[PDB]
Design a protein around this ligand. Sequence first.
Ligand SMILES: Cc1cc2nc3c(=O)[nH]c(=O)nc-3n(C[C@H](O)[C@H](O)[C@H](O)COP(=O)(O)O)c2cc1C
Ligand code: SF4
Ligand SMILES: [Cl-]
Length: 366
Amino acid sequence: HHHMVSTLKPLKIGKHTIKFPIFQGGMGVGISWDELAGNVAKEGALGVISAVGTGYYKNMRFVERIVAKKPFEALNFYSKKALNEIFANARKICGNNPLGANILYAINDYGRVLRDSCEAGANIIITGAGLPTNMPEFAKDFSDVALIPIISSAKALKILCKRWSDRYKRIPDAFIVEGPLSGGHQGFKYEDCFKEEFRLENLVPKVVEASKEWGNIPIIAAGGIWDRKDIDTMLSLGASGVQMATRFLGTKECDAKVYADLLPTLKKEDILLIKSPVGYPARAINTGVIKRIEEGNAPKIACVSNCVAPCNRGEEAKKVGYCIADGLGRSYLGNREEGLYFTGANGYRVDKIISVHELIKELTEG
Ligand SMILES: Cc1cc2nc3c(=O)[nH]c(=O)nc-3n(C[C@H](O)[C@H](O)[C@H](O)COP(=O)(O)O)c2cc1C
Ligand code: SF4
Ligand SMILES: [Cl-]
C-alpha cells in the first residue's frame, strides 16, 4: 500500500533510537502489554509496556498468591514473572526495536519494579504520578537504560535536573510534558484541570526553554495530540517528539479488549474528571465502578493488592469510593459492571478501531 515516505526524523533517547518521534503512552492495567507495545515498536515508534498490575496477566497465571481473586500484596500485583513474560512476548514481535516500561512513582515497591523492568530488557523507564527524584538510585546497575520523568511544569524539570545532578551526577534522558487533556492521572491540582494557562501549547515552550540550561534534553509532548497536524504543532513549539495514548487505545492490538467495544460508543458527556486513591485527578469514563458508586452498589473496599503508597492501605480508596487496583484489573479481565475505565479528553472521537500499522502510517506518512 502506498504511503509517502515520512519527513519525521528518528529520535534518539540516551543510547536508543526510535524510527519515528512518537511514543505510545503506557496504559495500565493491562492496556499496553505485549500485543500493543510489541506492535508499536515493530512499526518504529516507542512501544511502552505498563508495569502496573502485571499480576493480572492471563488471569493471574503467574502470581504466587491470590486472595479474593485479587493478586496478594505488591509482590504479586507487580509480578516479576508476569513482567518478564510480557516483555519476552513483546520481543517476539518487535525484535531489537526499543521498548519502554511505564511505572507510576506512587506505586509501592517502586524501586523493585524499576529493577525488574531493566532486568526484563526495557530500553527506557517512564515515570509520572510523582516527582521521581531518586529514579537513578534504582537504575544504577543498568546504565544503558534511559530514564524519562513525566512532568507538568518548567519548575519540575529544573528540580529534577538539579537534584539528580547533585546526587547522582546524572540528569534525565528526556522529559514527557503531560498536559491536562491526557488520560488517567493528571499532573495538575483538580482546580487547575480546566484552566487555559496549563494547556499543552503553553507548557511546551516553557519546558523547552528550561531544558536549554541542561543541554536541550529532549521534550516529549503528551495530552490531546490526535493526528499529524497536532504532532507538527508540538514539534514547531520545540518538542522533539510526542507521546500519544488515546489513539492507540483505539487500535485492534490493545491488550485490554474491552476498549474496542467501549470506545466507539463513548460520548463526550461521559468523560469525567474524578478523584483517585493515587492522589491526583484522573480522567475516566462514566461507566463500570463509577456508575456503581452512583447507584450505591460498588464493591466493598478491602486492600489486598496494596498497589500505591498514597492510598495508605485503603484509607484513600474508602474516601474516594473505589480501589484502583481492583477496578483497573477488572477492566483487563473484561468486567463491564465493575471495571474502571480511563480515557483522554479526545476519547469520544474514536469511531472505528484500526490496526497499529494503519495508525502509524496515518501519523507518519509525508
Ligand atoms: C486508558 C489510559 C490509561 C493510562 N494509564 C497510564 C499509566 O498507567 N501511566 C502513565 O504514566 N500514564 C497513563 N495514561 C496517560 C498516557 O500514557 C498518555 O500520556 C496520555 O493519555 C496522552 O494523551 P492522549 O491520550 O490524548 O494521547 C493513561 C492514558 C489512558 C488513556
Ligand atoms: S485499597 Fe488502595 S492501596 Fe490497596 S490495592 Fe486498592 S487502591 Fe491500592
Ligand atoms: Cl496514570
